[PDB]
Structure formats: C-alpha cells, structure tokens
Symmetry: D2
Subunit: 319 residues, 4 copies
C-alpha cells in the first residue's frame, strides 16, 4: 500500500490573485508550498486577463477544456478575477459535464499586499477540489473559508475579503483546519443534469442588459433591438419592474424575435410572476433569484435550445 494524494489541475485565467492577470500559474503554485501536503498540483495557463474583460470565448474554452480533461485528473481549481467570477461560475455550472469537483477561486488583495488573501484562498480551493464530498455539487466558488454554489454566489462588496456570499440560499459548507462540513447542496439542476452542450459551439447568442431607474432612457434597449440581439435581460426596479418607455420597447422586442427576461437590480430575492407584470401577455420570462448577469448566462444557453418564451420560462424554473 502507498498513501496517494489527489491530482488537481489549476486552470489559470488571471485576476488579482495573479496581480490583475500578470503573474503566471507556476508562480502562484510555488508561492504556496503547503499545497504539496494535500494534492499533486499541475497548472495550465488558459488566459491571463482581468475578469472585467471576461468574455464568451474564454467561457467556451474553459467548458470544453474541463469536459475534455475530466478523465485525466481528480479535480479542477480555476484561478479567476473576482469581478465576474459569479458569471463564469454559473456558465460552467450549466455546461461542465465532469462531476468531479470544479472550484473557482480569486483574491481581493494582490499577492504583494499586506495580509494577502490569495495564498490561503488557493490552499482552501485545493482542499475543496480534493475532497470527495465536493463531487456532484455543481461548480463551486471557494472564498474566505466558505464553499459557495455557482448559481447563488455573488460579489456583495467592492473591496471586502468576505465579499462572496450566497445571498438567497446560503453556503454549502465552511472550511476549518483543511476539512469541510457540507450541510447543503443546490437543488437546481446543474452540470450533467442540464441539456446545455457547448462542445461544438464557437459563439453564444447575443444577450445584453439594460438598467431601470427613475426617468430611464429607452435608448439602450432600442440599441440592442436595432442590432438584432437574441435576448435582453432587464435589471428592473424592485420585483423586476420596468420604466414605461423601457416596458414599451421590451414589449415590442418580445413580439419581434428578441427574448426578454425580467431580472432586478435589487441584490437579493426573486423576480416573481404574478405581481404587477403579466408576463404571459407580453411574452416575457421572470428570472427568479437570478440577478441580471446570471440571468444573461442562462438566457444565452436557453437560446441555444429554443426561442419560445414558455420553454425559456420552464428553463428558468429548472436551472
């Protein structure tokens, strides 16, 4: 018998954890020599960008690489910027078909700063990826000693190391002394339980986001309609409500080939049916607890399958 440690692959994309997006994956790994106590780590550099410039091409690269490399490794850690980690995490949650752990991690302070968070965050992300109990929970985010599901996780504060929270349904488990006590798992369908298959796609449907506020301009929504966008997500006020002129434009869009999802600029809670807006009349879809950027992720993937608003609403009710 020989004691064996799991093989973990780090897929590096950039971020302040490498600051954004300057230091290579080898350098990050070598800065945390205690990783050798818990895993055999191999690093690959996918891209080296600020996540404020994350895009559809990188999402598709990452999903295809994890799906292709699933059988070569025991788990994955993705180093990423914090700004759009919540978007990438949910894209991968819906398109990764590997049910081995896939864990995303970043840092709110650069590697050079006093009390930098990145080293311990990376250690705990590898702990999570190495834990057999992490499998079959979907794509995870590990930040500030917490395991968060890719669907609900969001950046709640501009600078706090403790910014990442699952604001509607809470975390899956807490990490202490290199161990996780998992008390929850996401009930929405993820990974191999979704129909989304991006293995042959080179691009995704065009989906844009418009913001609502007092005296809102309809010019952004008209610009997306004039460009023939596939979908528009509204960052509505309150329970997904729309300023009158935005409502007029989106009502046109939904009857003229553009899928419309009502989400909310409000940071917690669902955008529901059965409140002030008759979604069925207008052909709109209610986003539930998906915030605008997350609702975009699912609307792009829905539009790979269907343009029918009723079928899109059912997708928004299952994933």
């Amino acid at each position: 018998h020989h004691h064996h440690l799991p093989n973990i692959t780090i897929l590096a994309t950039g971020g302040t954890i490498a600051g954004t997006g300057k230091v290579g994956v080898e350098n990050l790994v070598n800065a945390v020599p205690q990783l050798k106590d818990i895993a055999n780590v191999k690093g690959e550099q996918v891209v080296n960008i600020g996540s404020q410039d994350m895009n559809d091409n990188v999402w598709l690269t990452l999903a295809k690489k994890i799906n292709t490399d699933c059988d070569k490794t025991d788990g994955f850690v993705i180093t990423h910027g914090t700004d759009t980690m919540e978007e990438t995490a949910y894209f991968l949650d819906l398109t990764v078909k590997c049910d081995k752990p896939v864990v995303m991690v970043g840092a709110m302070r650069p590697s050079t700063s006093m009390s930098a968070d990145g080293p311990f965050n990376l250690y705990n992300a590898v702990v999570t990826a190495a834990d057999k109990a992490s499998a079959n929970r979907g794509v995870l985010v590990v930040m500030n000693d917490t395991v968060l599901d890719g669907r609900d996780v969001t950046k709640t504060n501009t600078t706090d190391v403790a910014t990442f929270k699952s604001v509607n349904y809470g975390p899956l488990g807490y990490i202490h002394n290199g161990k996780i006590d998992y008390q929850r798992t996401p009930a929405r369908k993820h990974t191999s339980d979704t129909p989304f298959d991006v293995s042959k796609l080179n691009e995704l449907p065009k989906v844009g986001i418009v913001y609502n506020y007092a005296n809102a301009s309809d010019l952004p929504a008209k610009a997306l309609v004039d460009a023939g966008y596939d979908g528009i997500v509204s960052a509505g006020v309150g329970n997904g409500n729309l300023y009158k002129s935005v409502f007029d434009t989106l009502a046109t869009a939904a009857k003229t080939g553009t899928a419309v999802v009502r989400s909310s600029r409000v940071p917690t809670g669902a955008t529901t049916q059965d409140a002030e807006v008759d979604d069925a009349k207008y052909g709109f879809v209610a986003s539930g607890t998906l915030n605008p950027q997350k609702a975009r992720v699912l609307l792009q993937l829905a539009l790979t399958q269907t343009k029918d608003p009723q079928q899109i609403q059912q997708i928004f009710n299952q994933y």
Copy 2:
C-alpha cells in the same frame, strides 16, 4: 395649558402602499390606485399623534417616477415649509431610494421630510402600509427628526436618504442603509436616534431647483462579461450630459464600454464610475486612473444614486475635478 398635536402634511405619489388587488392572498395587484384619503382612514390611530392633511400630488407606480415629479415635490415642500410642521411622502418602493436622495439634496425646508411605502398592497393580508404610515408620521412629528436630511421610514427603522436602498425584491424588511446603518429605531411611537449623516444635505448644498423646468440628461450602463458597447454609444449619440457606469467590482468597466466612455469624457460628457455591487465604495486609486480619463468615482453611491448627484452636479458645472469634489462632499 392645552396639548396641541403637530400639523403633518402627507404628499401622496402612489406606490404599492396605494396598491390593490382582488384577493387578500393572491400576489397580483395594481400599484398607485387608492387615494390619500383612504390611506389616512386605514390608520385611525393617526389622530392620536398628528393633525394630518393629505394632498394627492400624483398617483403612479414609482417604476414610472421621473424628473418632473422630483421637481414638483422639491418645489412644493420648499414653498409650503412654513404652512406645516413636517411632511410624509407616500411613494412606491421601487425608486424610493432615488427620490429620497434627490429631495435630500434639494429640500431647503429644515422640518422633517419622511418618505414611506409598503411592500404589500393595501388589500393584502397583514399589509405593512398602515403601520409604516403611522411610524412615518411619528418620525415627521418628532422634533429630534429635524436637521437629519430627508428620511425613509420602513419596518420600524429611520434611514437616511443617501445610504438607504432596497435590498430585497419582496421582503417587508427590504430597506437598509447597507454601508453606514440606520439613524434610529422606532418602538411604541418613540425614536432613539444614535446617528446623523455627515455628508452635506438640504440647506447645506448649493443645489437650488426653485427655477429649474428640467434636469440634465444622465443615463446608466451595466457592465458584465462580454458587455455590449451599444447602450453607451446610444446615450453618447443622443448627446447625454452624463453617463453613470454600473461597473463590475470596484467600478471596473468591460474594455469596449471603457473605450466608449473614455471618448465621451474627452468630448465633455460627464462620466461617473459606480458599481453593480450592492455595498461598498467605488474608490479612487484602484485599477482606473480617473484623472487621466476625466472620470469621477462615485464612492458609496450606487448607480441610481450617483445619477441623482450627477444630474444636480451638471446644473452647477461640467468640470470633472469639480464634479469629483461634489461626489466627495454630498
């Protein structure tokens, strides 16, 4: 000596507080439907605490709030300040945080101005509106409420108009001052105030809307992965005075949005970096060199709040350094 109650004026604007549906249990309803009289008569205890007069200013959902209603309200409060002891504004919850900050910067009346709404319509089981209205009147009637700026009173809490925001789509407890906390809590019709806002408000600002017929055009663009530049270009093509960016993280911009706004700022469009992230400041001295591009950092002002201050800044100046000073003081 005889006890006299304060005179409180209710300026009604609509909202779910004035909403109705056909069932106490079904969620479906129409906002901004019931008049101010019906609201007042649903709270018979109000006569214990004030002499209430109701005026219907408009009756709309606050999803359709607009600059004209803002100007009407500021001018009415500043005109009528000497006729009453305090004001309550019944309003929708969806943009209450915007109206409250606009009034906090433009009201010159030293008397309490309190905004209130309801997350459940007037027809619903356990409707929140009646007690919210009672507590708003308590707050407007309390002499300790004066000189604290425009207030929002929701769920037994007195919140400053600058920091207060709607945090949850459905919860009666939605309104929170997420960066600096509430000013006071209300129990049994009494307030223990432990805080007051330090940023300049009301008669300490230079903003005077008494003779304005309209406000500068300021739009908001969202940032996210693969963000389109088409919204930003549409506001620039229309000659907008200002654009507020709902940035990712600490006010960061997707590169194609950054490019459009950098070009606009060079032509004289005012550009404020705010954040889609619901708490925390958009700072200077992070990843964007504001001075180089002619941008302004919003600090703790979220995108819709930063729009309010940017519109008022543009009544005074187009210079980015002067607008940043405004964003550091109000």
Copy 3:
C-alpha cells in the same frame, strides 16, 4: 373525482400570535377565513403559555402527540411564542418520527396591532404544511415568507418581523403567491433518521447554560456541578473559549460525571475542535454551529443514550 384539500392539524402552545398565550386556537383559525381555500384545518390547544416559559414537559407532550397522531392528518402547524421557537423546533426536529410536514409559526406583533404579522404567517405556515414537497425536510419554521430548517433557524432581532434567519446555512425556500420554490434541505440527520426516542420518557437529563465574559464568575458553573447536573453547555467567548475560572470548574465537571459542551455566545459560526482548547484532554465536546440553547437540546437527548464524551462528540457531528 372530487377536488380534496389536505387535512392540517394546528397544535396551539401560546405566543404573541395568540396575544402572549391568551387567545384560543379556534379564534386564531377563524380570524383567517382564507385558510379554507388551502386546507381542512382542525385546532387543538396543547398549552397556552409565553414561550419564555417553555419547558421539557411541553416538549415531551408535543413530540408524543405528533408521533401518536401522524396517521390521522396530512400535516401539522404548531403556533408558538417567538422567544424559544428555535429551541422547540430543534427538539421536535430530533424526536418527531412523523415525516409529514411539521411547521412552527409565531408572530412578532400581537393580533390587535396595526399591520399584525400573525394572520399571513399562519396562512403561509398552512401553505407549507400542505405542500407535499415540505415532507422529509425535518421540522420547519415559517416566518416572513420564508421556510427555515429547525436546526439552523434562530431569532436574530428583538422586535423585527423579519427576525428569524438560518444564519449559517440559509433558508430552504421562499413563499410567494401560496407556492414554495425549495432549493435546499438540511443534510444533518433529523426525525426518523435519529435514534432519539422520547415515547416513554417523562423527563429529560438536566442541562444548564453558563455565560462567559471578561472577569466571569465561576459561581454559576459551580452551582450546576453542586446540583449534580447531567450536562453543562458553555456560551463561550469567540470560538467557544472559557474564562480561566470557568475552565477550571468545567474541567472538574467533565471528570466528575457532568458532560460539558463548548458552544459560543457569538451568534454565527461554529465552535470548532483544533483551535485553542484540547477537547480530548479535558473530555469536552465542541458544539459546531449549535448555539448554546440548541446545544442544550442535543446534549439532553445525547444523555438519554450515553455519558461518554467521545460518543457525545459523534452525536454532535451527525445531528
């Protein structure tokens, strides 16, 4: 065919929802005539008390009554004071063997007050008890349009209608328009998956709680030891830490027949092993995310099975 509504039993115990503990169950039910749209409701008055005077005898009555009456009804709602609802809920979570919904509800404002919360809270508690998806999730608390598990739920604010929160792991689902979208279920073992069986017990082991703070007196802990308590839970400072003189007394207690659990006065997070206290040396048990009052519930039930600290720690790791 005939459309049939579920049979729901309301077991009334008191509370402000009946204000505390003055109005009878019939009166509460008749104040919400819309209950007839969703259930056939029958009410029984178990006791009529302020939950600040909740006690072991009422817990045992309730567990035996639900276990006995399980086959007569489709679901249970328990009307209760808010002050110790979190304790009763977790006791029932560990001792109820009915896997039909068991839902606890209260009110923060009395029935007579402006904008009283009780009516809609009771409506939503019956919605929850009538929903087939509520089964097999353990004992639930329904407050402020939210379904909360009995283990994690706690009262977070002295007066707020929104006081009840599952502060470590979040809620199970949100209620809108008489429907629940459940996204979570508790992983700790509950109800028919626990060994605790109170069917023949007339009393529970004596377990008391001591508080830690600067310059803490050891007199409370000595008083419980001198009375021969079966167990003591410490409301420790920080990560379950003990003031020196309290530590001295509890170290004695644990070697002299008294089970000692370290919990925390801190409102969120676990009291862990492997920090400053060598639990194994002293024979102490770490409470994890169980706050002092919840740790008391599980320590009483553990002491029905075992007095061995290692077996008590395993119970604290599974339930």
Copy 4:
C-alpha cells in the same frame, strides 16, 4: 518645512494577533505568546505612517480579560495622553467588544484610542494581523479620528466601541456594529468618516476610574427553555452588586429566573434586562413592568456590554431609576 509623522503608542495585551502555532495551515495555536516588538517588525510599512512605540502591558488571551487589566489600561491612557498623539491597543478578539466599551466610558484622553486584533494567528497563512495593525495605526494617526470615542479597527472598517460586536466565531470579517453601523471605511490608508456615535463617551461621562482599585461585582445569567434558577441564586448568595439577564426575545425571563431576580432587586441587587438575541434593543414597555420590579432595560447593549455599563453605574448609584437614566444616556 519638514514632514513629521505622528507619535503612536501600541499598548499590547495579547490575543490571537500575538498567537502562534507550529504550522501555517493547521488551526491549532496558543494566544498571547508573541511580544509587541515582533508585531511591529512584521509590518515594515508602519514607518511610512507613524513613529511607533510599543509597550507590553500584559500578554494574555482575551478570554481571560479582567477588571484589573481594564483599570490598568484606562489609567495608563489617561496618564500618558500628553506624551503621544494616539494609542493602538492590540488585544484578543473574544472580549475586545467589552474592553472597547469600558475604555469608551472611562478614557478622558481626547486623542484617538483604537483597538485591534486578528482572527488568524501571526504564524498562519494569509494572517490578518499585519494589515489590521497597519490600518489601526492609520486610524490612530488620523486627526479626524479624535472625539469619536474609543474605536475598534478590523477588516478595513472603523467601528465605535459601544455598538461593535463579534458576530462570527472564525471569520476575519466578524466585527460589525450590528444596530447602527460603522463610522468609516479605510481604503489606501485614508478614512471617509460618515458617522459618529451620539451616546455620550470619554470626557462626556461621569465615570472616573483614576482612584478605583476594583469594580462592582456584576454577573450574567442566560435564559432558555426550562432555565435553572441556580446561576441567579449563586450570584445573589455571593452578594453580587448587579446581575445582567441574557433574556429571550425582548429581554424576557424564564419564570424561575424572573422570581430570583425580582427578590434580589427588592434587596438592592441591581438587575438589568438584556437579551441573548444578537441585534435589537431590550425595550421598556413590552412584557416586563420594569418600574414595578426595580429592573433596568439595557436597550441595544448586549449582556457583556450591559455588564460594563452596570459596573460603572454602580460606582455612582444603586438607585434603579438613576441606573435606567445612565442606560438611556451612555
């Protein structure tokens, strides 16, 4: 003209900030082990911002904090006020909220007094202590910090000593002012203060500990279902000066605890109702008739904080009406 840095004195008391373990990754450690010099030298940037002098007052876990250390610290700060520009107190996190409020009521020095600790030991990977100490020194050096009472600086946040509390057992972000919010946030070594505490602190209180050798004996009892009266009776039998009840909900007491404390209050023991509930006030005019029993309602003071004010109240008075007035003003 030449730039001069402020003189800041670090009074070290121990804590996890001074803790050590034998591994950077294992959780096991010992508190209050490393001396103040080693802490200062772990933050080489401190010379950019202050002239730092360290004094080791004690080296203990704050789980073993006590009245003697409180009196030492208050007397030392009040004696040494003219020798320095500001103070930082390195301390354990577990009872930092208690020490901070005691100093907030007894320090008469008008200069900044800032408390700081660390949730991870000095030996741990990504230890929080170094940047926390840097930010504490920033806060103590900032002239805008003065006259705000005793402060706690943790996780880039400036918190008032009255409202601040430890909310989480393990998280670096644990310290929050859960009722009224923080005073300011720290970014790039700068603070934007937007709040100051209204309750009277420091030179505005009557509490003078300059000649005290000890403090009144005040104990804390917990309430829960089937609560034993044995803890309350043990403090009464020992002749305690005061007892604080960690009540259920809005300061309610299990009947047998209520009975013991009602009898004690009649003999002259001071009794404060607080709450085990982590946010919100323990109010008057709820289910307990305080006036009838001779009890005092703690308001937003949690049990350990209410103990601090009760000990100091008992240095001035034993009258329950005067103690309630103290609980309404400080």
